[PDB]
Ligand binder design. Sequence first.
Ligand SMILES: [Mg+2]
Ligand SMILES: [Mg+2]
Ligand SMILES: [Mg+2]
Ligand SMILES: [Mg+2]
Ligand SMILES: [Mg+2]
Ligand SMILES: [Mg+2]
Ligand SMILES: [Mg+2]
Ligand SMILES: [Mg+2]
Ligand SMILES: [Mg+2]
Ligand SMILES: [Mg+2]
Ligand SMILES: [Mg+2]
Ligand SMILES: [Mg+2]
Ligand SMILES: [Mg+2]
Ligand SMILES: [Mg+2]
Ligand SMILES: [Mg+2]
Ligand SMILES: [Mg+2]
Ligand SMILES: [Mg+2]
Ligand SMILES: [Mg+2]
Ligand SMILES: [Mg+2]
Ligand SMILES: [Mg+2]
Ligand SMILES: [Mg+2]
Ligand SMILES: [Mg+2]
Ligand SMILES: [Mg+2]
Ligand SMILES: [Mg+2]
Ligand SMILES: [Mg+2]
Ligand SMILES: [Mg+2]
Ligand SMILES: [Mg+2]
Ligand SMILES: [Mg+2]
Ligand SMILES: [Mg+2]
Ligand SMILES: [Mg+2]
Ligand SMILES: [Mg+2]
Ligand SMILES: [Mg+2]
Ligand SMILES: [Mg+2]
Ligand SMILES: [Mg+2]
Ligand SMILES: [Mg+2]
Ligand SMILES: [Mg+2]
Ligand SMILES: [Mg+2]
Ligand SMILES: [Mg+2]
Ligand SMILES: [Mg+2]
Ligand SMILES: [Mg+2]
Lengths: 83, 71, 208, 99, 124, 138
Amino acid sequence: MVKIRLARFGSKHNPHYRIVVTDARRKRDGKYIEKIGYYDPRKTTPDWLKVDVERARYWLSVGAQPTDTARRLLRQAGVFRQE
Amino acid sequence: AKEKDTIRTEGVVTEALPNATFRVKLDSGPEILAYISGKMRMHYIRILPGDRVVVEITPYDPTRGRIVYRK
Amino acid sequence: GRYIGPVCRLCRREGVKLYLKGERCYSPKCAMERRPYPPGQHGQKRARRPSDYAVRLREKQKLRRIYGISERQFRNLFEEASKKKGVTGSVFLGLLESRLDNVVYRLGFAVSRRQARQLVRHGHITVNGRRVDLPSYRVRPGDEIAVAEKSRNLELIRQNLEAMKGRKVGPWLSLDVEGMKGKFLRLPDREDLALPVNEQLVIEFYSR
Amino acid sequence: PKKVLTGVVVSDKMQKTVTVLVERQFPHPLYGKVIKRSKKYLAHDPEEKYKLGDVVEIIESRPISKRKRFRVLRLVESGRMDLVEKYLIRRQNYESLSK
Amino acid sequence: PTINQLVRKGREKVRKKSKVPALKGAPFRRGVCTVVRTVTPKKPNSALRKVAKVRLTSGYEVTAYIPGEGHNLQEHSVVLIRGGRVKDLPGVRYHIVRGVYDAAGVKDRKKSRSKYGTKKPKEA
Amino acid sequence: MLTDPIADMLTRIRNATRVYKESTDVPASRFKEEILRILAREGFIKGYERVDVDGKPYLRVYLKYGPRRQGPDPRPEQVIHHIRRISKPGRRVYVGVKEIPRVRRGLGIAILSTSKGVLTDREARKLGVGGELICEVW
RNA sequence: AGCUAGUUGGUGGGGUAAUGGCCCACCAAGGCGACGACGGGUAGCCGGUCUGAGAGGAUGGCCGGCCACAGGGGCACUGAGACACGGGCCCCACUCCUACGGGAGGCAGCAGUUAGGAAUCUUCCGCAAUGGGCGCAAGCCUGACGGAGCGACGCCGCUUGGAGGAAGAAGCCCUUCGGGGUGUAAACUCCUGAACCCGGGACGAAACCCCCGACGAGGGGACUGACGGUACCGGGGUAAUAGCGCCGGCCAACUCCGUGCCAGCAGCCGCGGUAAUACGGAGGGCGCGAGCGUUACCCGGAUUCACUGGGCGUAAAGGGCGUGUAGGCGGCCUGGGGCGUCCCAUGUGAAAGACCACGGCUCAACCGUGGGGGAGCGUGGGAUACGCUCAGGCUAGACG
Ligand SMILES: [Mg+2]
Ligand SMILES: [Mg+2]
Ligand SMILES: [Mg+2]
Ligand SMILES: [Mg+2]
Ligand SMILES: [Mg+2]
Ligand SMILES: [Mg+2]
Ligand SMILES: [Mg+2]
Ligand SMILES: [Mg+2]
Ligand SMILES: [Mg+2]
Ligand SMILES: [Mg+2]
Ligand SMILES: [Mg+2]
Ligand SMILES: [Mg+2]
Ligand SMILES: [Mg+2]
Ligand SMILES: [Mg+2]
Ligand SMILES: [Mg+2]
Ligand SMILES: [Mg+2]
Ligand SMILES: [Mg+2]
Ligand SMILES: [Mg+2]
Ligand SMILES: [Mg+2]
Ligand SMILES: [Mg+2]
Ligand SMILES: [Mg+2]
Ligand SMILES: [Mg+2]
Ligand SMILES: [Mg+2]
Ligand SMILES: [Mg+2]
Ligand SMILES: [Mg+2]
Ligand SMILES: [Mg+2]
Ligand SMILES: [Mg+2]
Ligand SMILES: [Mg+2]
Ligand SMILES: [Mg+2]
Ligand SMILES: [Mg+2]
Ligand SMILES: [Mg+2]
Ligand SMILES: [Mg+2]
Ligand SMILES: [Mg+2]
Ligand SMILES: [Mg+2]
Ligand SMILES: [Mg+2]
Ligand SMILES: [Mg+2]
Ligand SMILES: [Mg+2]
Ligand SMILES: [Mg+2]
Ligand SMILES: [Mg+2]
Ligand SMILES: [Mg+2]
């Protein structure tokens, strides 16, 4: 299965996440397919979370299955919204 | 520390050996390999086999000595 | 840590006065004003031909000591300067100056550089809004330095302010002398500063 | 873009197999002096339509034999034994300089 | 020479032999002595330098230079070697590192301590 | 056999400059002529023409020199100090448009043969081309 | 220095998801090779890492990708996928039980034991985050992971105070006996206030879940912390660890006593055999600073394997010459091909790093974000001066 999932990248107590497109069976930090989003849970950043929407949509269309956190993030950045 | 546990014992020079090293027959037992002291070298005081010389011997290895005394 | 020990000894070594205590290192007392010779036994001994390396080394020591920094840190700063585009020397000097403790000193917030550093450490100094207690800090220009509010009470600070109340600051800095504030505007130049440094020599020393 | 090469027939001793020497010219990684490297490829031709002395186009194909992975696309130019002769001479020399 | 020649052969990369077969490039190697004696240097120098034939955990028996002011080492004693050519002596490319195992520190040493394995003396 | 022509020509020129011979000879080719033209344009030579000595096409190469500076070694000032044929045979050096050398950081030239004819480094830069670095000149 | 007999090819078959000498039967007698085969050693490979002006050279730890292996060997099976790390079968090596017939094992998973060894961690907590598997889901598991512990092992940050304070206390050391040094260093005055105590105390965690809405979007609500009562803020609050190397030249720093080619130092030259700036100690200095030195190993400096960039009459170095194969190189003109060569476009060159910009942790390390570059390689177009190649011709080379 291909998932849009999150990848930790930062440091001890200072995490950062890459909302990413990739096969299930990889290292949670491994060679993914495409970087499409970045998010910080610590929200420190004025521009913290940002995703690239069109790419995400495309991925969804092919049938990339997002995990829960990732899904939430997508929703927040309005990938799942429809108008 | 500068250690003077050194033995200052007499020995009649037995063997003419190379490099101003001379096996000298001690009266502290056998003939050890005893070499010339630098002073002797400086003063050009010649040792031939048969000289009753004082030979400086450290306990660590008595194998080697030193011709301290000018014959 | 720092140097931390006998200071005007460094002054003595250098051959030139280095204002490292401020006052006294202003009066007839830096031991340089009187006693103008290297420390140790052979102070008045025949003054000999310094090696090409040696002069450079001395220069480096002068400069490094002036700001009072660990060698490692200095080296790092130099490296950074080299990396960054521009005249590696002048730029290096500017970077050195841009240091928090030095900035504090140049404002007349403390008469001495070590003293300034101490002040900075102790949560007496606040840049823009936060206290900063780490004297190596890069004051990036367009920045305001202030005395902390819960410590702007201190007698020493007041005295220091008075000592600069009137007398003119450098053209790259500024200050509010009343509300205990300060401005950093221009990242200073080689020609903005009057240190007995000859930074070329320092650079040469570093090269190998 | 099925990798294609201009090479020269050097042998037809095997059924349907034409041996082709590709002389590839590239510049040395360190020196840049332009070297001339020959590599043999055994090529598939169901006709034996090709002979020694012929220069041919060679296509990177699907295999037919362990170490025969090229079909002969097309004939370029016949009547240049020159290049083959040299190779043969070299081969002969190879046996000589041993013992 | 000329580029074609170079291409044919290349440059024979200067493959470097090490000055120490303590093996594994091991910064230190431990061993036990077979003998412990003193050795005359050569023709530039005349002194008596203390040295020990030491068998190794790799098997290579090395005479090894004891430094300091005078050792306490006997025979069946564990010693640790740092290498590093001694100029005067033959067969000896090795310093014993005093301050570990049986080679106890240089007593009375008061200046350059670390090299010798001397604990800090207590001031006033 | 004259294994390089261009290099030989260059060498001859150098020799002439050394000995203060005002004009040298050298067999005629198109490439050579082009090179000479470039040199002339630059100002490395007074002039050149194409004679027929014996019956064989040849080039009059009118050499250039600097004013006779007096004193110790009065010998005329050198215009071409050094000229090295870079892309020798059996070592053909092709530089890209990124790689075209800053020869004496400006003061002199590299004669580059390009797809767009024989020329100098500045010219190459102007057109935006790389090619073969026949020779270095200063 | 020759290697090869399933070995190189063919025909037919089998086997495979699929090509194939993968295997087999039959036929052919080839195939590779000095442009370095086979043989031996060595060694996971790389993105990179370090050095380096660069070209390069070494290195391939962590982090990422690929491979290969799970005591050694051999084999399949099941399955989408293994020849299957904590699945199976077999022989052997080894440990364990045994009622001697036989069984059970495999930490190169985390942690730990043991050995080896210079040397390398806690038989830690947690499912909170993120990811994995299962599942409608709740949830279940998860030594992936997230953290803490131990080690100056590395990098980076901070403290060991600061301000005054003698024409110069003592202590110690040197002296030409006046003096100088230590050194504003101390003491002493003043201030600050790591430690340290108490008060509060997180961001990381809003989802999945429930309901309105059709189980869609959207909207409201709830639970949810190993770190850790930590980070951090507020008050209080004490002047509160300095070390290590060197000190002849290189190389930055000099004197005295002790020693006398002895004891000793040494990275090299070398120093020491009685006035040692080289040894031991003291003061003084100088380097660095919670480190600093030694050793190992790599590069550099070594333009000392040299492409950038070395040479060869005498220094190491021209072979004894000749002919000649491969190979390398090659006059002048004209024209074509366009392989080299160049160029443009474009595809690639994953992320991480390195480089620039900005941002975040009080700075910085560290991280985040954005950008740029990038040798090489593929694909389409272009250019023909140069090399290649094809054709024609020339006479300077060469031959007659
Ligand atoms: Mg989850
Ligand atoms: Mg003795
Ligand atoms: Mg078939
Ligand atoms: Mg086979
Ligand atoms: Mg092998
Ligand atoms: Mg191996
Ligand atoms: Mg390499
Ligand atoms: Mg196995
Ligand atoms: Mg199956
Ligand atoms: Mg298995
Ligand atoms: Mg398994
Ligand atoms: Mg496997
Ligand atoms: Mg383990
Ligand atoms: Mg043990
Ligand atoms: Mg052990
Ligand atoms: Mg660990
Ligand atoms: Mg638990
Ligand atoms: Mg249940
Ligand atoms: Mg369990
Ligand atoms: Mg971890
Ligand atoms: Mg003080
Ligand atoms: Mg107080
Ligand atoms: Mg508390
Ligand atoms: Mg000196
Ligand atoms: Mg020493
Ligand atoms: Mg000499
Ligand atoms: Mg020394
Ligand atoms: Mg000394
Ligand atoms: Mg530090
Ligand atoms: Mg160190
Ligand atoms: Mg000779
Ligand atoms: Mg010939
Ligand atoms: Mg030929
Ligand atoms: Mg050719
Ligand atoms: Mg030609
Ligand atoms: Mg990248
Ligand atoms: Mg990036
Ligand atoms: Mg910042
Ligand atoms: Mg022709
Ligand atoms: Mg003739």
